[PDB]
Design a protein around this ligand. Sequence first.
Ligand SMILES: [Mg+2]
Ligand SMILES: [Mg+2]
Ligand SMILES: [Mg+2]
Ligand SMILES: [Mg+2]
Ligand SMILES: [Mg+2]
Ligand SMILES: [Mg+2]
Ligand SMILES: [Mg+2]
Ligand SMILES: [Mg+2]
Ligand SMILES: [Mg+2]
Ligand SMILES: [Mg+2]
Ligand SMILES: [Mg+2]
Ligand SMILES: [Mg+2]
Ligand SMILES: [Mg+2]
Ligand SMILES: [Mg+2]
Ligand SMILES: [Mg+2]
Ligand SMILES: [Mg+2]
Ligand SMILES: [Mg+2]
Ligand SMILES: [Mg+2]
Ligand SMILES: [Mg+2]
Ligand SMILES: [Mg+2]
Ligand SMILES: [Mg+2]
Ligand SMILES: [Mg+2]
Ligand SMILES: [Mg+2]
Ligand SMILES: [Mg+2]
Ligand SMILES: [Mg+2]
Ligand SMILES: [Mg+2]
Ligand SMILES: [Mg+2]
Ligand SMILES: [Mg+2]
Ligand SMILES: [Mg+2]
Ligand SMILES: [Mg+2]
Ligand SMILES: [Mg+2]
Ligand SMILES: [Mg+2]
Ligand SMILES: [Mg+2]
Ligand SMILES: [Mg+2]
Ligand SMILES: [Mg+2]
Ligand SMILES: [Mg+2]
Ligand SMILES: [Mg+2]
Ligand SMILES: [Mg+2]
Ligand SMILES: [Mg+2]
Ligand SMILES: [Mg+2]
Ligand SMILES: [Mg+2]
Ligand SMILES: [Mg+2]
Ligand SMILES: [Mg+2]
Ligand SMILES: [Mg+2]
Ligand SMILES: [Mg+2]
Ligand SMILES: [Mg+2]
Ligand SMILES: [Mg+2]
Ligand SMILES: [Mg+2]
Ligand SMILES: [Mg+2]
Ligand SMILES: [Mg+2]
Ligand SMILES: [Mg+2]
Ligand SMILES: [Mg+2]
Ligand SMILES: [Mg+2]
Ligand SMILES: [Mg+2]
Ligand SMILES: [Mg+2]
Ligand SMILES: [Mg+2]
Ligand SMILES: [Mg+2]
Ligand SMILES: [Mg+2]
Ligand SMILES: [Mg+2]
Ligand SMILES: [Mg+2]
Ligand SMILES: [Mg+2]
Ligand SMILES: [Mg+2]
Ligand SMILES: [Mg+2]
Ligand SMILES: [Mg+2]
Ligand SMILES: [Mg+2]
Ligand SMILES: [Mg+2]
Lengths: 46, 62, 103, 77, 94
Amino acid sequence: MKRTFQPSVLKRNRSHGFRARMATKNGRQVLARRRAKGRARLTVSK
Amino acid sequence: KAKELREKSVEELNTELLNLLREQFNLRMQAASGQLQQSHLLKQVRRDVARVKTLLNEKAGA
Amino acid sequence: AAKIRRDDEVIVLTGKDKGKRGKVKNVLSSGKVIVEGINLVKKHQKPVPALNQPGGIVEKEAAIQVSNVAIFNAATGKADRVGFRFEDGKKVRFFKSNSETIK
Amino acid sequence: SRVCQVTGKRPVTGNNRSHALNATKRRFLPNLHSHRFWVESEKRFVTLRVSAKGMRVIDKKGIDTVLAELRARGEKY
Amino acid sequence: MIREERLLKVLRAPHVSEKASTAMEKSNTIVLKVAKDATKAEIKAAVQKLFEVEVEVVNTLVVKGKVKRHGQRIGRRSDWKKAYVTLKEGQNLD
RNA sequence: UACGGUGCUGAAGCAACAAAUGCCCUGCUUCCAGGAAAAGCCUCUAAGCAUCAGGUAACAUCAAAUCGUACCCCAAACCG
RNA sequence: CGAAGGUGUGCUGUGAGGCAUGCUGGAGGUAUCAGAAGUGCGAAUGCUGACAUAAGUAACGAUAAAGCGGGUGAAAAGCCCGCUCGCCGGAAGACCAAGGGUUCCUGUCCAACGUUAAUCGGGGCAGGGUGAGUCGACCCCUAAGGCGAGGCCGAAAGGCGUAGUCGAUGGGAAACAGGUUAAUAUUCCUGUACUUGGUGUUACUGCGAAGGGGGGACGGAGAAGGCUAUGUUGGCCGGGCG
RNA sequence: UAAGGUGAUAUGAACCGUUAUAACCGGCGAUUUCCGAAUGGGGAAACCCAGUGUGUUUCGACACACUAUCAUUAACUGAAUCCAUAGGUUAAUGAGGCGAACCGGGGGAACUGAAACAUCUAAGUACCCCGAGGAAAAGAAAUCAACCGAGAUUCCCCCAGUAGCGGCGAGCGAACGGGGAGCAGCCCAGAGCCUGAAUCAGUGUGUGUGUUAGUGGAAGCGUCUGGAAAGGCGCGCGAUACAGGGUGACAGCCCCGUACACAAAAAUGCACAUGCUGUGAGCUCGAUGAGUAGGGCGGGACACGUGGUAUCCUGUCUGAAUAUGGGGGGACCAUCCUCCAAGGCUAAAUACUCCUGACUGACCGAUAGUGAACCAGUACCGUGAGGGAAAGGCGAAAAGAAC
Ligand SMILES: [Mg+2]
Ligand SMILES: [Mg+2]
Ligand SMILES: [Mg+2]
Ligand SMILES: [Mg+2]
Ligand SMILES: [Mg+2]
Ligand SMILES: [Mg+2]
Ligand SMILES: [Mg+2]
Ligand SMILES: [Mg+2]
Ligand SMILES: [Mg+2]
Ligand SMILES: [Mg+2]
Ligand SMILES: [Mg+2]
Ligand SMILES: [Mg+2]
Ligand SMILES: [Mg+2]
Ligand SMILES: [Mg+2]
Ligand SMILES: [Mg+2]
Ligand SMILES: [Mg+2]
Ligand SMILES: [Mg+2]
Ligand SMILES: [Mg+2]
Ligand SMILES: [Mg+2]
Ligand SMILES: [Mg+2]
Ligand SMILES: [Mg+2]
Ligand SMILES: [Mg+2]
Ligand SMILES: [Mg+2]
Ligand SMILES: [Mg+2]
Ligand SMILES: [Mg+2]
Ligand SMILES: [Mg+2]
Ligand SMILES: [Mg+2]
Ligand SMILES: [Mg+2]
Ligand SMILES: [Mg+2]
Ligand SMILES: [Mg+2]
Ligand SMILES: [Mg+2]
Ligand SMILES: [Mg+2]
Ligand SMILES: [Mg+2]
Ligand SMILES: [Mg+2]
Ligand SMILES: [Mg+2]
Ligand SMILES: [Mg+2]
Ligand SMILES: [Mg+2]
Ligand SMILES: [Mg+2]
Ligand SMILES: [Mg+2]
Ligand SMILES: [Mg+2]
Ligand SMILES: [Mg+2]
Ligand SMILES: [Mg+2]
Ligand SMILES: [Mg+2]
Ligand SMILES: [Mg+2]
Ligand SMILES: [Mg+2]
Ligand SMILES: [Mg+2]
Ligand SMILES: [Mg+2]
Ligand SMILES: [Mg+2]
Ligand SMILES: [Mg+2]
Ligand SMILES: [Mg+2]
Ligand SMILES: [Mg+2]
Ligand SMILES: [Mg+2]
Ligand SMILES: [Mg+2]
Ligand SMILES: [Mg+2]
Ligand SMILES: [Mg+2]
Ligand SMILES: [Mg+2]
Ligand SMILES: [Mg+2]
Ligand SMILES: [Mg+2]
Ligand SMILES: [Mg+2]
Ligand SMILES: [Mg+2]
Ligand SMILES: [Mg+2]
Ligand SMILES: [Mg+2]
Ligand SMILES: [Mg+2]
Ligand SMILES: [Mg+2]
Ligand SMILES: [Mg+2]
Ligand SMILES: [Mg+2]
C-alpha cells in the first residue's frame, strides 16, 4: 500500500526547515523551546 | 623569539613570515610521506608564524 | 611548593617496604612518586614482534603515594617533615627538625 | 487601527449583560471619523482619523494647538 | 595574480594510490590532496610555483568522508578535496 | 600465460525488402470546450554620445568558475 | 582476633519478634532512653526488571528446481570454478529521477547480524574509488504561489497588498565516436568538433532603453505521406564437412 | 608560580624545561572562519550571487573597505502647482535580537464548585501579547478621622473570617484603628531681585575598602596484629589549627588544608575626597493644571452581584464654578470638619534567582535523587510540534594473567 510518509527533501525543508521556522513568530517560539530543552538537532535542516 | 622579532622592521617581519610559511610547506610535504621523523617541528613553525602575525598587528594598525 | 622533589632521597613510611630508602626517580602529577628500587612489581610483559620486545616477566617499579614517604634526614639518620622559608628572597626547603636547609 | 488621533481613544472591552445577567464579552468602539481640517496657518487641509469627542476638542483648543500636541507626541498627520 | 601567502596553504599532501601510480606513468598526472576551498586556478598557480613544473590542466573532485565507529561511538571523517593535476609533456616531478 | 588475463595481427564490412507508438510534425486537416508567462534572441528609436564612446567583421589570445558525478533505484539499499 | 549484608543451625517470647553461633562476606555497625518518619505488601487487568509456561511445539516469507565433479577450508546442500537442468525476458534485463547516503571495489575476519550452516554477504575491520567550458545543478527567465519598502487595515500579535523580490514541474549557448579502471567516464586518453564571453589589433561606422514592435508562443481529435531506429533474406568474408 | 611539562579516553611517538619568557594560574591585549537580529541582494541556516571605492597584476587576475531596514536630526534636492508641500538623495546618532524568575500594562478561558444549572464560582487564574528594571510599581493628600486628631508610598503582624456582599445559596470578604520594618521630600504651569549660591548628573584624579592569581602555616615515635596501621598497647608533643579531605583498615602530630598572619604589576566594583563639565541655590511678588469636575446612557473597578449605593475608571452624548471657589466625610439635604483634582519627579523597607562563591541538612543513595551520577535531552519514536529511555562499583596498586 502507499504509506503516509513519501519523502521529499525540498518539501521537507520548505515545511519544517530552519528559515521556515524563523519566518513566523510562533516558529521562532518553537526554536526557543528546543534551545531551552537543549536539542542537538535544533531543526530538520541538515 | 618575542624579543628578537620585536627588534625588526615591518618589511623584515614580512620577509620572515614568508620564510616561515615556506618551511611550513616543506615540513608538511615531508610529513605527508613518512620522511619527517621530528614531529615537533610542525608545532614549532606553526607557533612561530603566530608570533610574527602577532607583531604585525602590533606594529601596524596599533 | 612541592615537598618531595626529583633528586631527593626518601625513606618509606608505610606499606610493604616500611623503612627502606631510595632516590625518587620521578614524581607523577597524581600525587605519586616512583622511588628507585622499592615498590617492585613483576609485570607479565606481553611480547610484541614489532618494536622488538621478546616479552617476559619484567620486574619494575610501581608508584607510591607521596604521603607514604618522607625526606630522609642524613644528619639525624631519620625522616623529617619539610618546611618552607625564604632565604635571600628565595623559597627554600628545610627540615622541621633542627631547622637545617635541605640541599 | 480604531484609535482617535486627537484624544487617544481606543476600543475597550466590556460585557453584554442580559436580563438574566448573562455576561458575554463585547467591545466599545470609538466614534471615529476621517475629517479634513482646514489649517489656516499652513493653508492646507489635514485629514485626521478623529473621534467626535476629539472634534469637540479641536473646536475648543483650535487645530493649531492640537497639531502642536501631535508633533510633541510624535505622531504623523 | 594569486597572492603568494595563499599558494602555500593550497596544497596539503600527495595522494598515494594504485590509481595515482597509474596516472603518473600513463597520463603524466599527479594526484594531490588540496585545501577544501581551493579552486582550480589556485592549484594551477601553486603547483607551477611551489613545484616549478608546467601544469596543463587541473581536475578536481570532493571526497566525502566515511562514517566510522570507534568502539561503539559513531563518527565521521572529514570531507577533503582531491586534484588530478596533469603536467605538460616532458615535465617531471617526484 | 599470475589461467584471471595481457600483447600482437586482422578478412568482408554490400544490396534488396519489410518497417515503427520514433522523426518531418510547434506540420496538415478538422472540431469547440477556443487552447501559460517572461527572458534569451530580432528590431525601432528616446534622452544621451559626436569622429570619442559604442556597433559587426575578420584574426589572434584568454577565460568558461563553483557544486553534483560511487551504488541501488518496480528494490535485500526507497516508503512499509 | 572480622562490621553490615547473605546463608544455615540451635535457643527463646503470647505475637510482631529476639539472642547466640557455623559458613560466606571484607568494612562498617551501634546499646540504653528519647526524638522524627518516604515505617512494614500478595492481590490494585498495579509499575520496572529478571525468569518460567505452552515447547524444543508452530514457523524458517510465494510450488521458478535442481543434479554432479573439482577447488578452498577446522568443517561445503548454500561459497568459488566447471558441465548440465529449470525460470524471467514490455522483465525477475538495461538507464535515471525521487529517496537513501558508501550499501560501490579490494584485502581480511565469522563473535553478533543473515529466520539453518557459512569459508559467503548489502555483516565487522582496514584500504581504495566519484576527474566535465558542452551532462545536471548553480545561473538568466517567468507560472501557480510565497514574501513584501512605502501603503491600507487591525486591542497587541498581526491581516492584505503596490513597487519589487522570490518561486520549476516549463523557456534559455555548445560533444561525439573509439579506447581504458578491481572500482569513474559524453568527465580520463586518442581522434574529430562546437558554444558564449573577455581583452587585442585590422578594416568598417549611428550607437544608445527601465521604452515601442516582432519573436519566443503553446488545445483536443483525426488523416495520410515521406523517412529512420530496427529486423529479415541475399550477397560477401572467415570457419565447418559432422 | 614553578621542577616538571606537551587537555581527556590513551598508551605511544617526537620533544620542551629544571632558577627561569618549559608548563600552569590571573589581569589587559591580539586573532576571532561560516550560519544565526544577520544587516550588500537572495536562500531549502552553516549556501548562492553581486555592486561601489581605494589599492596591487608577472594583465590571468588578486587584496581590502563599504553598501539592510526603521526612528530622529541636519544638509541638499524636489512634483502635480506660483510659492509651498509631499517625495528623493546623502550624513550623523540610535534601535533591532536573546535570556530563568520577579514587575507594569493590553487581552482573557474552561474544567470545576454550586451535590443539576444559567446569576455566581473557578479567576482577572492558566494562556497570549506589549514594555521595563535590577528591582519594577506606587508615592508627598481634592487622604483619613470625628469635633479629638493623624499626616506620602510600599511591606509584615493584628483588627477579623468581624462589618458586610451573595439564586442572602455555594461562596466572596474588607476598612477604621493599633503594633512593627523603613522613612525624604521636591519641581513646572513666572516673573523679578540677587548670579552659579543647593543638589544631582557626567568626567578626571587621589585615598580607603573589596574582587579577579597567590604566600607562610604548628606538633610522633616504639611495639602487637595484619597483605597493608591511621587500629590495639605504651610513651610523648601541637592547638587562636580536633573544619574537612586524602593516604594499602579508624591519623590533631604522614599529606592537602584549617586557625592566624600576610600579598597585586594590571583590571574593576563600592565608598569617600577633590578638580572640571553641566545643573541651578536663596529671597520677593505672583500665578494655582476645562471639553476638566459633574450629569444622561451602556459597561467595568472598588469585599460591595444596582441594591437605598457613596467613591473610582470611561465607550457614548453632554457639560461647570475656577480660592468670595471647589472636592470629600457611603443614598440625599443642612451644619460643621477636612482637603485642593483635572502637571510631573523621587531612595529605603518589598518581589525573584538563569548565574557565581562559601557553607549547611533527623534530604536521596543508582527502580531513589534532576529525565540525565555513565559522551542525556543522547539513543530511539514522530512529517511535525513534540515525546524520551536504559546504562554506576576489579584491586591498595594493573601487579589487567609472560609462558
Ligand atoms: Mg462566565
Ligand atoms: Mg580534460
Ligand atoms: Mg567537478
Ligand atoms: Mg553511475
Ligand atoms: Mg531491476
Ligand atoms: Mg520487496
Ligand atoms: Mg568469618
Ligand atoms: Mg546502615
Ligand atoms: Mg547476619
Ligand atoms: Mg555475618
Ligand atoms: Mg569507612
Ligand atoms: Mg510506604
Ligand atoms: Mg512483592
Ligand atoms: Mg490484601
Ligand atoms: Mg501485581
Ligand atoms: Mg513469554
Ligand atoms: Mg520450552
Ligand atoms: Mg502441542
Ligand atoms: Mg506438530
Ligand atoms: Mg512444521
Ligand atoms: Mg520457504
Ligand atoms: Mg559440491
Ligand atoms: Mg539451495
Ligand atoms: Mg554455480
Ligand atoms: Mg557500512
Ligand atoms: Mg559488493
Ligand atoms: Mg569483503
Ligand atoms: Mg561458526
Ligand atoms: Mg548464523
Ligand atoms: Mg561490507
Ligand atoms: Mg548543459
Ligand atoms: Mg508575484
Ligand atoms: Mg511595512
Ligand atoms: Mg503580503
Ligand atoms: Mg528570478
Ligand atoms: Mg526543470
Ligand atoms: Mg533548464
Ligand atoms: Mg559502474
Ligand atoms: Mg518586448
Ligand atoms: Mg495536438
Ligand atoms: Mg535502414
Ligand atoms: Mg552426422
Ligand atoms: Mg598523553
Ligand atoms: Mg547576507
Ligand atoms: Mg537577507
Ligand atoms: Mg538576486
Ligand atoms: Mg462555568
Ligand atoms: Mg456543578
Ligand atoms: Mg519607580
Ligand atoms: Mg483641626
Ligand atoms: Mg601554601
Ligand atoms: Mg602544615
Ligand atoms: Mg599516608
Ligand atoms: Mg579493608
Ligand atoms: Mg488644561
Ligand atoms: Mg490643581
Ligand atoms: Mg469626583
Ligand atoms: Mg465623569
Ligand atoms: Mg453618579
Ligand atoms: Mg455610569
Ligand atoms: Mg464626562
Ligand atoms: Mg499632585
Ligand atoms: Mg535514575
Ligand atoms: Mg545496587
Ligand atoms: Mg529515569
Ligand atoms: Mg527523525
